[PDB]
Design a protein around this ligand. Sequence first.
Ligand SMILES: Oc1cccc(CNc2ccccn2)c1
Length: 330
Amino acid sequence: STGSATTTPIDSLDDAYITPVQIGTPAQTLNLDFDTGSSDLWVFSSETTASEVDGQTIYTPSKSTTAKLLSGATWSISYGDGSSSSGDVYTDTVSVGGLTVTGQAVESAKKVSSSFTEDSTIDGLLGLAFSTLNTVSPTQQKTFFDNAKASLDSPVFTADLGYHAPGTYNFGFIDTTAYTGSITYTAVSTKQGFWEWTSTGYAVGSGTFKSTSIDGIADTGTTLLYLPATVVSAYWAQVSGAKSSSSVGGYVFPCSATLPSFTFGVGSARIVIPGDYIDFGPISTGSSSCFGGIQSSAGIGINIFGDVALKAAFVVFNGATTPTLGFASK
Ligand SMILES: Oc1cccc(CNc2ccccn2)c1
């Protein structure tokens, strides 16, 4: 089997991407944030505290003839930005782009933090990291990809995120029309539960490439590119008037600037992030200070190749017995 679904930016900044997902019988379609940096499929639901729902579409298990309470199971997750959610668990039929999993754990939110409530466009998350990170207790649950893997034509999914435009998530096949050149594959460590790999270095604009190992994760659920402070300082030093602002919480730059590109290495290959991809616009409406798309990872404990980096490539998440990542230009 295979599946193919379009993923769409939630706003004009590409702050996140939403993909329609069918849950239950008859289908209830919710728009979920596919997140290769976590491993829980959770949704706004009829059980979510009413004051914490503001415009989201909810899953109602009592209206699904295939829903079954997973008795005794609870879940609770906190993400790296301080957001969180928790609740109980059903199993139900879940389909993505024509690919169907029966008995998928659907984690029903009883509580969500303010950042989720305030984002009316995101109806939940669909985790695509390794199932060892799943938070369901006392019986850990498998991701949608882990459950589908054996049925897929090939044990892979691909992320093809757009810049200010829709893109695609495919399951079970590699669309050879969706990229240019060849795909360069690189080793993955699953020891922390992430799609963790080592970039071979970077360049700023037309500058020379610096060969240096940068360990980080491929994370579709994080907006920005978070890298070591040395690398990020070298980038922003090329933008007149750019500075790190403690009050804003990162690097800002004059909105009148033209940003340089940023290149990262994948083995001997190179992925170029155009400068425009690094502009996240005014810090507040009408401000002439703009927020940068490359930020320091120093406070996080891991480097994160988020959407800013991944949307410059066609990315293969290879879930063979020894997992690997593939990157191609497009
Ligand atoms: O580790 C991180 C460090 C900084 C920012 C983020 C954001 N990532 C999220 C937020 C909510 C849901 C999924 N991913 C993660």
